[PDB]
Symmetry: C3
Subunit: 467 residues, 3 copies
């Protein structure tokens, strides 16, 4: 009978409706599929290169500013920090206390880029210190960025190999200790008391993080870093919550998730107890100063009125605040969900291979050293490698007794100098692209087959049943 | 005519049946698609860190136990191995002979963790030797695991950078050779005669493999290892033969394919000729001893009855067995298909970046050394760095003639000490997840469109043809 | 009415036609999906290993050939290059001038593999220099390839770890400078004046590129390179323009994109101004010689007729040509689109982890050195480490005054020797396979559902309308 026909048509209608609902719910689950493809002829951008000296403070600079009539704030601060008693003494002896309590005089204790960088060369063109930008850092105090995206437009690489990349001859400015003085190994820090250079190779125009993402370079070796470029392309809403925005910080930075988290930490500190930390990115918010500045410490020194008995305890509630919040943030990981930090939509990263070779050869030491002493200030009064130049000159101009002098000169030069080549190994860029797993066109195609037929069946059945 | 209608309907029926068969056969090919996604707010687990000393045997320990009245088994074994002749002498001089033929006395020749580890620190909290677990190893003899998942639950990381990770100051216990003795370079081993530390960073609770997966760390440098966590999630049956089981071995281990293969090798040796090898994982199966134990070698020494002429050949069939099977397994790769070893369903791995810096600076050497000699046994009678402390103390308390002493002290200290920081570079975890390429829901959706309509057509045709 | 029926059928026909067009256009967009799978039981091929000495020229060889009556071309060339004036003097002092202008005598200045390689061992079997193939290189002058795929078939690895891989003890042949001579640091090169070994680990039978893809190895350290194999499988047309061809060059090479680009550069130079460059792959095209050969420079030396006033300028238009085209190619990246260089269909790559340990230990130095001096020519007249052997022998046969000799011997030996182990960390191969995103079977299945039904509807409508 035709009732069987009607029931048997309506069951097919139900099946078609199930198909429609299933496909629509699949399209509303905005799945993504990633595919990796090698892009050639894509212009490669040379990364930003941040170099920091592992020894944050030059002791010889302190010694000769100690003899200077000028730089009185340094004498005041040192005598002040040794005359009293402070809770959290590990911070008072740190370099962050120097930075926070001596705003401008602290540049007289650090390393200047002219002292460090004795040779630069990019793409077979000579550098100077004129296209490095300096930033303050915690526990390194200064980090100099090449290709930071501020002085100049972004550099590009059109060749491979060490010749065409960046090449630096750096002197770590190691200093000879005085005969009777010795240092104290801070057994509560995992980074201090080394020599070398901390190098960060990061995406062009992004924020550096020398402590986390850097790698060390030892003196006396030519170290080469070969880079391979990678590009990650992500999808925005509704396929994901990635963003094209850029970080603000102290200067506009290209967006990276880690730097967003660091800025979130800084904002949380500022919100909670009205000061910012030196061990975190600077923000420059009004009415806010560093967590650890002791206001009027110069007045705290000088009892014009009867006050401040020696070995006193100076109350620093801001240090306790900042330390407590640091510990809470370091041991609890819940703030991350409360302050945004979406992933960047497009992100360039690098795969690096670092390798060492012995450098420089003895036969070429003297001439190299002749450059090093003929570039800087004509005041060669005293440097760690003056003895090296004297020994090498006395060898060249007029063999055991001179074997010791050659050995000592090489030992000094290789204790102080290093070379660093950063270059692109290949110009092919491996790109990981997100795609909509089930796009709108695919759904349109899958549905258009059943649309007309089944809503036609529905129209016919509805118009027949109405009578 | 209507015969054309019937034929033209049945051809569409055949086409629909082809579509059904094609989609069903595609769904029965259980294909998988992998996608990589960055998981944030996922708790990162600090890896297991296994450290081994590259010099397996301390010669000074042998020398002073040689002078001891106690430790007579050592004299017996040494005099025994030099008085006779053995086939495969490369094993008799090895450390595996020491381990196998002196079950407990062999702990008196190796390096103790208290001698090696002079400073540990995790997450800014002090360690001791109390949370390292010792395991025997071939060709290193001892490997100490931190975060092995047995003493404590798995550790977790909530911060990045060297400060918050594991930091170790290690002394490789280098020993000064005697004036008249020299060693013999075993030109038939590619690993011996080095100094440093072999480090393995492996998934938490998995089985270490120092020879294969380790990396060396040289003395006199602070070496930092920055880690990035990766997670691989695989699918079980019917999409693949991955498993959630765990390896048994000597102790329950988290499953890894390489360790399963090593256990398979050990089981094959045990099955074939009833002994196990030291160069492979221990199994502890009853009635089974090491391939290379010479039973009653103490009795073989002592001819109570007239026997054992000097320069005799002691028959060791077990060594020949184990060597022959080792060579067959190393040159033939067919056993792998016969002993299971499915891949683990979930597996965490790490990308590591290792870098060196010069350490420690001279200005901070003395104080550091003051710790090293003030931690261990009050018996400072003789150590490789006693001269270093003497020279540095004579420099500090009361400048060429002292320049040589400073140079020598630094040379010793940097020949013996090293520092190792292992930390997480980022807390984001890149996860590679398998997905069913063509799931059940997708098949249901693709088929439901044609199901009702075409089996309705089939029912109508069948009921019409029956008359 | 039935006109509504006809219109309502034809709209469904239009929808079905849209579905057909959409699916066909999707199938004509030959998309690909990549999936990564771990292949076990797949035979792993040991890579090709190219080693080059970083010091390209041994000065002692020049000195003693300078005293030889033979090798007169060297005296002629040296006296010629110092008597005149040349534009682009950085090339005349280079090693490429030596190579190009002294075709066969230049082998008397480089390093011979017998001088460098003092021990090889593969898969526990001894090597010789007999299965290394030598190739000329720019700025290294010689690169010796192991497992290059020419002398023998491709080697395979059936085991993991340092024991079963390749192990080399190499001497970098460092030479002691004369008391009164010193070198000139070429501050216009980023690679010169180092010591060590440049190692390239590349796909079996491919073309090496030591300057771009190599990594340095320092003397005095045992450096271990652990490799993990990766295989990339790409799709040919119509899914992509990958190829299965092989590069020609000077010898048949397995295809790699970078080597194709280098050969393209060489062909472009040859086309543009009829000479080839030494800093690029050799091609051996007829009527073509190196860009930088000065024809009849021996005749240019000797004015039989009154000519060639001293400090003359010798016109070398070929050098200017080759330099100008090099600069254009290095700063412009448009040639890449004009000379093919499709990606290879199948390509094996490696992930490498390099690590150092101190080597050799002092206790084992003498015996090691006893091998080194007892392998080479019985003429031990003068070598950089003769003093080391003398000191060690005088220590062993008959303790401060001997502490200096031990220290000096160790300093020499560790300045000259190094060890290199290259091995496979795991035998699992991670393969990235391309797949057709929407294959022919998938399209056939998606279309067969609608084919019969809707072209049946079309046939019925067409045959009804014709009357
Ligand atoms: C820090 O500075 C103060 C200010 O000069 C020093 O005080 C003087 O110390 C010297 C010698 O110790 C005395 O002769 C002066 O009379 C002191 N001046 C005053 C105003 O009392 C002080 O010694 C410095 N050092 C320390 C550790 O406090
Ligand atoms: C290094 O810094 C110098 C100093 O500015 C840069 O030299 C300038 O380059 C621009 C671009 O060609 C010129 O317009 C200026 O005239 C240059 N300044 C001077 C004083 O000559 C140089 O470009 C920087 N190097 C790199 C690689 O960015
Ligand atoms: C600054 O502080 C010191 C420490 O209190 C003062 O030294 C004491 O000063 C009082 C009052 O002048 C004397 O009675 C004590 O005998 C001093 N202590 C000594 C000498 O050990 C110092 O005078 C203060 N500076 C001033 C008041 O200008
Ligand atoms: C951006 O989107 C991702 C996922 O699309 C969010 O990640 C989730 O974060 C919560 C917070 O703990 C977790 O419980 C979920 O498991 C995460 N999902 C996944 C798939 O990992 C992320 O939170 C979003 N960003 C913000 C700022 O909310
Ligand atoms: C190994 O030990 C045996 C047992 O003591 C040594 O044999 C003694 O050797 C000394 C000197 O060579 C003789 O004076 C004794 O008479 C020996 N004892 C016996 C019981 O014969 C043997 O010398 C040791 N060394 C070697 C290489 O065999
Ligand atoms: C290092 O080993 C020590 C020794 O057990 C561990 O100290 C114990 O830690 C647990 C967990 O907090 C406490 O319940 C015990 O009371 C501790 N023992 C002692 C003697 O105090 C320590 O946790 C280990 N370090 C790490 C990082 O695991
Ligand atoms: C253990 O073995 C050695 C080697 O055979 C024995 O030395 C010989 O002993 C026999 C019998 O006592 C003598 O005839 C030989 O002259 C000995 N060889 C010499 C002295 O070179 C040794 O005596 C044995 N130990 C015993 C039997 O207690
Ligand atoms: C687990 O499954 C994999 C594939 O799903 C098996 O791998 C096959 O192993 C055989 C043995 O030589 C090879 O001939 C095949 O080519 C392999 N297949 C693939 C796709 O690589 C593996 O053997 C299985 N495990 C066990 C223990 O049988
Ligand atoms: C290069 O070789 C020529 C050829 O011998 C040298 O010319 C000779 O130089 C010596 C000393 O300078 C004179 O005594 C000879 O008379 C020269 N020979 C001729 C034929 O003139 C030349 O000195 C060498 N060196 C240089 C820098 O030109
Ligand atoms: C190193 O080179 C030698 C020299 O040819 C190779 O030895 C040959 O190996 C083949 C294959 O087994 C034999 O057929 C030849 O008879 C061997 N030659 C000699 C002179 O014995 C050796 O195989 C090479 N090593 C490696 C790992 O390829
Ligand atoms: C090769 O060239 C040199 C440089 O011109 C010649 O030296 C000059 O030769 C001419 C002609 O013989 C003399 O008049 C000059 O006085 C020479 N210059 C001096 C001595 O400084 C050299 O003679 C040429 N060789 C020949 C012609 O055989
Ligand atoms: C091989 O195919 C790829 C894409 O399938 C081609 O890559 C294109 O190259 C041109 C040349 O600049 C670019 O403008 C396009 O953007 C590239 N496409 C993609 C998707 O990246 C490549 O050119 C082809 N090979 C040759 C030799 O033509
Ligand atoms: C804080 O900022 C406001 C706005 O600029 C300013 O008026 C005020 O003076 C600041 N606070 C102090 C203590 O000066
Ligand atoms: C300063 O006081 C602390 C405790 O308050 C004490 O340990 C220290 O010895 C004192 N310093 C001097 C120089 O007395
Ligand atoms: C082997 O094991 C069995 C079972 O434990 C035991 O009875 C037997 O004694 C063992 N073999 C020997 C030789 O002792
Ligand atoms: C021991 O015997 C071997 C051969 O059996 C011989 O080479 C060696 O020289 C002998 N040792 C002594 C000390 O005679
Ligand atoms: C160039 O090659 C052709 C073909 O082999 C040859 O005949 C000719 O002689 C060559 N050119 C010169 C200058 O010899
Ligand atoms: C050679 O000529 C160049 C310039 O042409 C000049 O700089 C140089 O000093 C000359 N050499 C000698 C030895 O005179
Ligand atoms: Ca579909």
């Amino acid at each position: 009978r035709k009732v069987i026909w009607a029931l048997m048509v309506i069951i097919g209608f139900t099946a078609a409706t199930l198909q429609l609902s299933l496909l629509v719910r699949k399209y509303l689950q905005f799945q993504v599929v990633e595919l990796s493809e090698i892009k050639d002829s894509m212009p490669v951008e040379y990364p930003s290169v941040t170099i920091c000296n592992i020894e944050p403070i030059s002791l010889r600079k302190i010694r000769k500013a100690y003899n200077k009539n000028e730089s009185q704030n340094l004498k005041d601060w040192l005598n002040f920090t040794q005359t009293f008693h402070f809770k959290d003494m590990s911070f008072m002896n740190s370099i962050r206390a120097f930075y926070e309590n001596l705003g401008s005089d602290a540049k007289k204790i650090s390393h200047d880029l002219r002292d460090l960088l004795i040779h630069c060369r990019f793409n077979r063109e000579e550098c100077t210190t004129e296209n490095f930008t300096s930033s303050f850092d915690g526990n390194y105090f200064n980090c100099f960025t090449f290709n930071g995206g501020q002085l100049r437009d972004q550099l590009q690489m059109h060749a491979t190999g060490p010749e065409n990349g960046l090449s630096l001859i750096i002197s770590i400015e190691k200093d000879e200790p005085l005969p009777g003085t010795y240092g104290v190994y801070n057994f509560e820090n995992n980074i201090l008391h080394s020599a070398g250079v901390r190098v960060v190779v990061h995406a062009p125009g992004s924020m550096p993080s020398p402590v986390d993402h850097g790698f060390d370079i030892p003196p006396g070796y030519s170290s080469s870093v070969g880079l391979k470029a990678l590009l990650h392309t992500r999808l925005s809403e509704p396929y994901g919550n990635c963003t094209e925005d850029s970080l603000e910080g102290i200067q506009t930075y290209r967006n990276t998730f880690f730097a967003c988290l660091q800025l979130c930490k800084q904002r949380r500190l500022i919100r909670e107890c009205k000061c910012k930390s030196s061990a975190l990115p600077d923000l420059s918010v009004e009415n806010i100063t560093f967590c650890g500045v002791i206001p009027d410490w110069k007045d705290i020194r000088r009892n014009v009125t009867g006050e401040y008995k020696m070995n006193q305890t100076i109350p620093t509630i801001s240090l306790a605040c900042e330390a407590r919040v640091q510990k809470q943030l370091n041991n609890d990981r819940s703030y991350e969900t409360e302050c945004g930090c979406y992933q960047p939509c497009s992100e360039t990263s690098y795969l690096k291979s670092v390798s060492l070779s012995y450098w420089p050869l003895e036969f070429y030491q003297l001439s190299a050293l002749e450059r090093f002493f003929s570039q800087k200030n004509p005041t060669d009064q005293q440097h760690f490698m003056k003895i090296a130049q004297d020994f090498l000159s006395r060898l060249a101009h007029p063999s055991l007794s001179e074997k010791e002098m050659a050995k000592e000169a090489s030992d000094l030069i290789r204790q102080n100098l290093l070379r660093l080549n950063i270059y692109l190994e290949d110009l092919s860029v491996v790109e990981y692209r997100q795609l909509p797993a089930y796009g709108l066109a695919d759904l349109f195609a899958d549905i258009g087959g059943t649309l007309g037929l089944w809503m036609g069946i529905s129209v016919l059945t509805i118009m027949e049943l109405m009578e």
